[PDB]
Every structure is written in structure tokens, then in C-alpha cells.
Symmetry: D2
């Protein structure tokens, strides 16, 4: 008479579209009874609110808090300046809302990611499995390429946020699997169509993801892979470390963008491994008919971040973190970044580059303080 199993899932999507994406996203979420938290912005038209109510009458537990309601909640948490407007950083509101409402699983998605299977929510519930002995995947160079789990034309690619200095030698890395205890708390689902690559790779080969052929893997301690926020489930205990980093900080006078989830993906990952938890890559797989972007503009935004990421990732392996839970571990991580900001050296490490990590660390602790205020 095994009963009592009931995992709650909330899907977080921020968007400025008219809401037409709900026609293909609602069926998977409606069949599973999950909640969808749509976060609009000041540049979001009134057609999105009309689409949420239309799908709410069809059985979808969808909410769409207006910017006034969002700002009131942030005001009451003493963080009115934390989350800016006209930015997809406002998905942090949905993360916080789902965390306050006690959901077990928080699935971050974008408005151009459509589930391909009916068990989309169920597959993301893997972050609630708990610790068990299971096949974990280790890599001799400390990196795993989740795009090697996909059939990609015209050539092999690496995901967005993968360090560039490790790519040429990655072909000689030794991949091994063995039975070990692991506790999956983050599940990064893969994507067909336009894979999550950086603008450099997209401008070079225009990749196309044909099929998910590699299955799913759980990464052992010491093996990393970037985690995005377009098809990623985070267990509610790990959510405090999943704050979407604020963009716009200049590197050599060039404002960075498009890497908010590259940092959050690595940050929640180094926090999970310090607490004995793991990151999973594989199913559920979505289609990514990506919104229309100017690739040269995407390149101009990503370069300031890619100029620093390899150094930051290298120094993060040197810093030991402290903390008993994800709140304390994330705060310890924020102070680790401030020490890294002054020790790292290179041509790209101008005074505004070093100060980027200092303001990021403050906003990280402003985010955890808001969660502590909610208690």
C-alpha cells in the first residue's frame, strides 16, 4: 500500500511575448497539474495576461503577477532595487515565488522551449529522488560536454558557457562511469533544434540538434558542465543558489549580457557538490525553435563574459567553500568571488572587470537576505 508520494512542480517563465507559446507549453504542464509562473515585465503587452487567463480556464494552474504585484513583494522583502526591469533577470521573481509557495521542483524555462514528451514534468522530478548509489560519470579533465549526448550537424559543438581553454584537449579526456552514491538536485534537460551554444559556435557552424542519443548522465564530484535556465529543474533546497546573475556590467567598457544563467548554472553546481549533491544532464528533452536574434549582437554581448569565464572557473576550483546548506554555501561562494576578483590576472581584468565580481557578490547576498527574510 505504497502511498503518500506527491511531488509539486512549478515552472518559471519570464517573457515579453503575447502568450502564444502557451498553446504548446500548457498541455504537458496541465496533464501533470504543475504550476506555471509567468513573469511579465514593463515592456510586456497586455496580450500575455489575456493568454494566461484563457489557458487558466482550460485547467492550467498559471499565474501572471503584474509588475506592481512583483514590486510590492520585492518592496516587502527590502530588495526593491535587486531585480531590474526590461530584462529576463525578472525570472528571479518566479524562482522566489515558487520557493515561497513550497514547491518541491522549480523548472526554469524560456518562452521558446516546448516539451516533446508527455512525461516532461515527471522526468524533471528526478531532483526529488534523494541519495542513492547510481552510475556517476567522471572526466579526467574535470569537464563534461552535454552536447555530445545529442546528434548535432554539421559537427561536434560545446554548450554555451563551456570554457574555451579546455575545448581542444577535451577530445583526449578519459570518460568513466561507476556506481557511487549521488544525490541529484539539478536536472538540466537537453534541447533539439537550435542547441544552447554560444554566439561564437552559432556564427561558425549554425548547429542543429537532431536527436538525443546519449541518454542521461549524473556528474561526479570534480566534473563540471554549464547549466542553463531554459530547461532546468532545481530542487527547492538548491534554489537559493540558483539566483540569475544580473547582467550589464562592463568589461573594458563593454557591457556583458546573455550569461546570467551561465554563472547561476556554475554557482548552483559548485554549491551542490560542496553539499554532496549532483547535477544531471539528459531528459526531458524540449524543442528550441529559438526566438529571432541578431547573432552579431549576441556575439557583442557575450564576448565581455567569455573573456573572464575561463579564469573564474579555474579559480573556483582552488577555493574551498563553507556552509551547511545552500544559503550559507552561496554566501560563502559570494565572498570567494570577491577574493578571486583581486587575485586573478590577465589583459581582460581591467578595474571594471574586477568590480563586476564585487557587485555580483553583493547582489548574491542581497538575494539570500531576501530569502532569509521570507524564512
Amino acid at each position: 500500500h505504497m502511498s503518500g508520494r506527491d511531488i509539486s512542480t512549478a515552472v518559471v517563465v519570464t517573457t515579453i511575448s503575447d502568450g502564444g507559446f502557451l498553446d504548446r507549453l500548457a498541455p504537458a504542464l496541465r496533464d501533470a497539474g504543475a504550476r506555471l509562473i509567468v513573469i511579465p515585465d514593463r515592456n510586456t503587452g497586455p496580450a500575455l495576461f489575456a493568454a494566461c487567463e484563457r489557458h487558466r480556464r482550460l485547467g492550467l494552474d498559471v499565474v501572471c503577477p503584474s509588475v506592481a504585484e512583483q514590486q510590492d513583494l520585492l518592496e516587502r522583502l527590502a530588495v526593491p532595487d535587486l531585480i531590474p526591469y526590461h530584462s529576463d533577470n525578472r525570472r528571479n521573481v518566479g524562482y522566489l515565488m515558487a520557493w515561497m509557495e513550497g514547491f518541491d521542483v522549480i523548472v526554469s524555462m524560456d518562452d521558446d522551449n516546448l516539451p516533446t514528451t508527455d512525461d516532461f514534468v515527471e522526468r524533471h522530478q528526478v531532483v526529488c529522488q534523494g541519495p542513492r548509489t547510481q552510475p556517476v560519470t567522471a572526466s579526467s579533465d574535470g569537464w563534461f560536454n552535454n552536447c555530445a549526448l545529442l546528434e548535432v550537424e554539421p559537427t561536434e559543438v560545446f554548450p554555451r558557457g563551456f570554457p574555451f581553454h579546455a575545448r581542444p584537449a577535451h577530445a583526449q579526456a578519459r570518460t568513466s562511469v561507476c556506481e557511487r552514491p549521488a544525490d541529484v538536485r539539478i536536472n538540466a534537460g537537453l534541447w533539439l533544434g537550435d542547441p544552447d551554444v554560444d554566439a561564437i559556435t552559432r556564427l561558425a557552424v549554425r548547429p542543429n540538434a537532431l536527436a538525443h542519443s546519449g541518454g542521461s548522465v549524473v556528474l561526479a564530484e570534480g566534473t563540471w558542465c554549464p547549466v542553463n535556465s531554459q530547461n532546468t529543474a532545481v530542487h527547492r533546497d538548491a534554489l537559493p543558489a540558483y539566483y540569475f546573475l544580473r547582467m550589464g556590467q562592463p568589461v573594458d567598457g563593454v557591457p556583458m549580457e546573455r550569461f546570467g544563467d551561465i554563472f547561476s548554472g556554475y554557482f548552483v553546481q559548485v554549491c551542490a557538490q560542496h553539499l554532496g549533491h549532483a547535477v544531471r544532464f539528459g531528459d526531458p528533452v524540449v524543442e528550441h525553435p529559438r526566438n529571432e536574434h541578431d547573432l552579431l549582437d549576441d556575439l557583442h554581448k557575450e564576448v565581455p563574459a567569455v573573456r573572464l569565464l575561463d579564469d573564474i572557473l579555474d579559480h573556483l576550483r582552488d577555493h574551498p567553500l563553507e556552509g551547511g546548506d545552500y544559503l550559507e554555501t552561496y554566501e560563502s561562494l559570494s565572498y570567494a568571488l570577491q577574493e578571486i576578483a583581486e587575485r586573478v590576472n590577465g589583459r581582460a581584468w581591467s578595474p571594471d572587470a574586477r568590480a563586476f565580481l564585487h557587485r555580483s557578490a553583493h547582489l548574491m547576498r542581497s538575494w539570500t537576505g531576501a530569502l532569509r527574510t521570507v524564512a
Copy 2:
């Protein structure tokens, strides 16, 4: 009679000159038995070291630590990256050394400031008299113009770092003096010749300080005036809050300079008033035959900081500080600056302008951490 009160004074000068300035600076120092700490840089010629040895044999207690000895000291204190080279920020090394060696008074000077009286060191010892009921000067607008204590041609001027928003209405402010308890811990001596004005004032009216006619004043709580580092005595208790702020941070892509002591002067002043201590302005007066500068280059370096100073000072009046001594109060101030960085608004507050306060706050706490590590 009274005996046993042996007040120790250490003068701190950082320079890239050939040491010729020692000829006019040493007599007042060696006659008082004061120590002179000369901090050279990588761009400092070998003639300075020869001049320190020539004036040492004449009876001056002068020390001139090489950059290797400086870096060895800073590395042992776990701050090898705190103080940059090719910068007058290296005077922080002299601040640190004078504090380690237990000096009562630390006098910050530049290599073009020359004492005018034989009691130069004695007058600066006023930061050691302790609390006493004394005439304190208050101003209705909360600001005091120390250049009003001087006879200046061709017109009235304000000191460098004086907020611009308060200058037009300062003529209507009411100045009052009354007997109140005060504990002087900072004594900003005045300057004849080229007064300490900003590049705006120097380019506009080219002022010349003729004489010191206003005497000396002690500013009551709530009355502020910028404090520079070219003729300023700081009691050793207040020394932890007198860290010379690191420049080079861009504001809208323009690196700031020449305001490192404007911030230190206001920071030690806010910390002192929180602890019930006061700032004094007046004697001892020095001659300032200012080193040759490109005034348009000084303006280009000062404008980035000028654009933010009025806002920073306004928010500092609304942030009360915590702490029982200068170390705790300075750290409390550093955290207050990070809150101010996210609350302040204005066209000049770009993401790099806000990150300037965040990196500065970390550097302030890196400074206090080295001070704790010493003791």
C-alpha cells in the same frame, strides 16, 4: 611638573622625486625627533635613496623601504594585491608601517608640502590632547569651507572635494561657535601658495593662498569639510579609517583619479564623529609650491569622481554606522557604501559607477583585515 608624556610622530610621504624636497622638510622633522617614512615606487629613481641616506646622517630618522621590502610586508599580511604600483596609493604602506611601529601621530604629507614654522610637529600633536570642552564650530548647512580661513586671490574658493550642490547656498549658511566637549583626532593643516582646490577651480581662477587669517576651528557633529592627505595629522586610533582609496575605477568608462584622499578624508571624518571625535582645521600651515601638472589632465581625472561625490555624501548623512572603535566603524561604513551603491539614482550612476563602491568596500575591508592581522 608634568612628565612622562612622550608623543611620537611619524610623517608619511610617498614620492617619485629625487629627494631634493628633504632639504626643506627635514629640519622641522629632525628637530622634533619625528620619524619620516618615505615610500618609494617602481618608478622612483635611485637619487631618492641617496637623499634619504644623506639626510639620515644629518640626524633625521628617515626610512625608505624598497619595493621588495614593501611587497614582502604586504604579502605576509595576506594583502599582496591591495596596493598598486606606479601610484601614490603606496602611501598606505607608510600609514601601515607607522601604525605597526606604535606611533601616536601619523602625519600624511606630499613631497611638495613644506612646513613654515618650527613648531610644525608640535602643532600636529593636537590630535593627542584628548576630550575637553572647547569652542566647536557648527554650520547651518552642515558644511564648513576651510579655504575661508585663508586669504586667497583673486576670489573666494572651496577646497577640493567640497560638494558642488552646496556651494551657491553656503554664503547664506550661519556659522556659530560654542563651548562643547570634543576629542580632536584629525588635524588638517592648511596650505599657502597653491591651495588644495579641484582642477575646476584651478583652471577657472588660478588661486593663490596669501596668508592664514582665520585661525583654527574644530567642527561640531554634523558639520563636514573635506580632509586631504598633504598636511594632515591622524591619531593612531583613527588611522584604521584613513585608508587611501584606490583609484582607477571607471565611471561611464572614464577612470577616476586624484580623489583617493577625498574619500579617506570623508571616511575618517564620518567614522570619527560616530565615535564622538572631531576634525580640526588650521595650523600648522605649510607652503605648497605644487609640482607641475597638466591641469586639463587633472580635470579629466577628477571629473569621474566629482560626478558621484555629491550623491555619496548625501546618502552618508542618512546611514548611521555601528562599531565601538575605528576598525569596526570603518567596516560598518564599507557595508553602508554597498547599500548606497544600489539605492542612489542619477545619470552618472552606470553599472560601473555602482560597482566602484562595491570594489572599494572590499578593499576597505581588505585593509582592515591586514590591520587586524598585524595586531
Copy 3:
């Protein structure tokens, strides 16, 4: 008696105001039968058009071409991109129109400059008297300070655009007057209230022009003074060289502004002296109750141009110009600026500072090309 000399005057003002300034500007204009050309912008409210119609019925020959009519005119002249919107550069449209319509005198004014005498237009007609032996003023340093013709408190000031390298030694310069032939083609009227000083001078001493006490002067060949566009009459022959320089060019990454007329004033002045013509300073004097400005923002906009002006003016004294009229001489000047851009050296002459002169020269010739296309 003498008859047949019908001098036509057109006043040119560009504005984003509501037109209330017309109440004090129209009387002197309509009493003299002068035309007022008001150039609105995209950011100009609809109240200006209603004010032009209200003052037209009172007898003022005022025209206010819509942005559509402006762009239609500029497109037909093959310069649709020459004059930007949301900028006071649009006064060039008024310059062009007044020149097409055959006016003898073009008076450039701002919407906060108000005549003080009934003979405002008559005094500006001095640019039409022709050559005659008259008292011309020469200065030993090659510069004249027109603000010395005014009673200014609290101290002596220089006009906006006056080179800084020459200010300290200008007090020692010898001013001489003697009878020489001169042909006045530019008449820069002076201003009471807020004088036309740079943001450096305004922030430093906040000057107030009390009265016009020095009379009027005509500057001999080799003696220069900046000429602004807020109360300046230009003879139609000299109008082709009075193009208002387009701002927005970065200098070390900082866009310049507020100096468009500093360049036009010096350019029309160098071209006039090459053709044997002269610049006059003095009456008619206007009141300048200056529109409200953020003075620190004015400083941020002016510094990029201030950093280059002294060098540009120095090289202009060593480049002789060719041409028989203002069109040919202005084009010769534009090519001279391109040679200067590659010869000048200095810390402020970054590749974008040099390219500023190259794009400006093309725009100057784009302007003269439209002038040739008109005629």
C-alpha cells in the same frame, strides 16, 4: 537723401520649449520687420506651433517648419543625414533657410536670449556696413577676452571656448587700437545675467554679468575671440562658413557636446580674416536668463572638446587657407583640419579624437555641397 538700402534680417532660433520666450523676443523683431525662423525638433511640444501662430497674428513674420518640411528640404538637397534630430544642431536648418531666402543678416539666437534695447536688429546690421577705415583692436598674444567688456561678479572670467593655455598670460598682453580698414561680417553681441562661460567657470565662480561697460571693438587680423551662436549676426556672404558643428563624437570614449558653436565661431572667424573681413564684439546686448542646466552634466559634455581645443587653435594659426569666397575658404579649412588631425600630438589625441576632425571635415563639405546645390 540716401534711399534704396533695404537691409533684411532673419533671426534663427531652434527650441524645444513651449514658445513662451516669443513674448519678450517678438517686439524688437516685429518692430524692425525682421523674420524669425523657429526650427522645432521631434522632441518639441505642440505648444510651440500654437505660440508661433499667436505671435504671427500680432504682426511678427515668424515661420516654424515642421520636421517633415525640414526633412523634405534636406532630402531634396541630398543631405538627409547631415543634421540629426533631438539636437540643437537643427539650427543649421534655419541658417540654410535664411540663406536661401536671400536675407542680408542672419542672427543666430537661443530661446533664452532676450533683447534689451529697441535697436536690437539695427545694431546687428553692422555686418552690412562694408569696408571702412575704423578703430581695430589688436592684442599682443593674439587673443581678445570679450568678457572684459562686461562688469562681472565675483571675479574676471573668460568666454566659453577661450583657450586655457593662454588664460594665465593674457593679463600681461598689450591691447592696442588704431585706425585700419576693416569689413565687419560677424557681430557677436554680448549678454547680461548668465555670461557665456564654460561649465568650468560656471561651477567655480557662478558669474553674473552686471552691465556692458567696455563698448564695442573690432578685432584686427591675428587677434581671435570665440564667437557663440546665442546672439550673433552673420552677413549672408559669411553664412556658408557658419555651419554649426555636429557634436556626439567621442574623445577617449567620451562624447563631446556644447561646443558646436565654438567650432563654428572660430571657423567663420578664420575664414573671414583670410578674406579680409573682421569680427565685432559688443552691442546689441541681450539678457540671458539661462535655461536650467545640470552643471556637472554640462562639464561632462564639454570636457572632451576642451581637451582638444587648445591644440586645434594652435595648428590653425599655422595653416594658411585658400579660396576667394567663404565657400571655397571653408572647404580649404576642412582639408586643413584633416592635416591637423594627423600632425597634432598629445595624450588626448586618441584614434577617435583624430577621427573626430575627419568626420567633421566631411560634414563641413556636405554642408557646402548643399549650399552649392541650393544656388
Copy 4:
């Protein structure tokens, strides 16, 4: 008795190496009797001069003019500021020197391009063949990918400077060959090993050129392909249009670099087609064991240029050029770029981007004026 055929060839290489590359470059040039003009810089060590003299005694007609000799020649041509130091732009000295000395063929190379066949110079003499009916290659989209003539792993690549907006649709372009009159004046030889790709492609797939399998092609009028300066022969008549563009101009405050020959390659190509001449791609093929570069630094330098190149190439097809030879056609091209600078629109077209084309056009005409002075 067919005699009298004797084509002269000069190879131009600028380098800061110690001269060891001469051991593998001299045999091909010595066997053909060609001249090698090595252009050193101020950051070039004395070991290069010792290597040129060592190879000169072995039979190589190699010259290495010191920076004093280079600057004296430039001084006598009234272009002392045209060519900067610490830059590979100094290859323009070698272009000019070979042109003054009357060589028929000028082969631009870098110090890391080694010939693979003995007929290296002979194959480059094709630019002296003269007009004849020959197979010309046309493309329906107006672009040709010379990297498709090579066997490249791991996937197909495009050359550096190839427009990005045309790459996805290039696979559907129709390539056709037919007998037509053509006059080859530029021969772009291909490269094995590290192909001449942009940093985007190199950071994405790390290409490797295995073999030259496509043969050689001559491009018809209307079909373009970028031409670099690492293995390219230019007939002396076309050399005036082959000026290596000066880099360092900021685009949105980011200085461009590494595209000096991308512009010169397209510029000499549009000039050749207007004069009825053609560009050849294929043999002779060199090995490119490229010097060690930081690819992320290469990316940071190339992005400012790639942000504008697609627009510039599009507008160059709209502008008809004038001129009877390459000097007049290049000068007409320079004026065409100035008109393009004001008509083009886009986010990347900041004021400093538009001014880049204006200063480039001046330097282009400064280069032709120097060649006209040589006459």
C-alpha cells in the same frame, strides 16, 4: 626565338621575429632570384638584421631597411605620420619600396608562411599574364568561398573577412564556370595547416587545412572573396590600391585590429573589377604554422570590425567607382566610403564607427599622394 620574358618579383614581409623564418623562406626566393624586403619595427631585435645578412651571403636578394631609413623615406614623401610603429601596418613600407624599385610582382607574406613547392614565385607571376579568354567562376549570390578549395577538418569553414550574413544561404548558391576575357592582377595563394579563418571560426572548430584539392579559380565580375596579405601577389599596377588599412579605430569604444588586409583585399578587388581586372585564388600554396596567438584576444580585436563589415560590403556594391587607373579608382573609392559612412544605419554604427571610415579615407588618399609624389 621567343625571348625577352623576365618578370621581376619582390616579396614583402614585416616581422618582429629574430629572423629564423628565413631558413625555410629563402630557398624558394633564392632559386627564383626574387627580392625579399624585410620591414623591421622599433620592437624588432637586432637578431633579424644578422639573419638577413647571413642569408644575403648565401645568394638571397634580401634588404632590411632600419626604422631610421624607413622614416627618412616617408619624411621625404611628406607622409611622416602615415605608418605607425609597433604595428604590422609597416608592411606598407615594403609595398612602397617594391613599387618604387619597379618590380612587376609584389608578393605580400607574413613570417609564418612557408612555400611548399619550388615554383612558388613562378605561380605568383600569373598576375603578369595579361588579358585572355579563360574559365572564370561566377556565383549567384556574389560570393566565393576559397576555403572550399581546401580539404579542411572537422567541417567546412569560411575565410577571415567573409561576410557573416551571406554564410547560411551560401550553400544554395549556384556556382558556374565559363570562358570569358579576364585580366588577373591579384593572386591569393591558399594555405595548409591553420587556414586564414576569423577568430570566431578558430575558437569554434579549430580548423586544419589538409590539402589543396579544388585547384585554382578566377572570379568573374560581381563575385567577391576576401583577399589576405599572407600569401598574395599583386601586379604593380594594382599595388596603389593595396594599401594596408590602419587599425586601432574604436567601434563603440573597442579598438579594431587584425582586419588591415580584409579591407585592403576587398579594396584592391573592387578597384580591379572596375578597371576590368580579376582576382585569382589557388596556387601557390604555403604552409601556415601560425605564430602563437591568444584566440580570445584575437576575438576581442576582430569583433569591432566584423560588426561593420557586412554593411560596408553591401553598400560598396551600390556605389559605382570612377577612375582610369588604380590611383584614381582608389581615390574615388575613398570618397565612396565617406558617403557610405553617413548613409549606413545599425546599432553598431556609433559616431566613432562612422568616423573610422572618414579617417581611413584620408589615410587612403595620403597613401596615394605619396605614390604620386614618387611619380
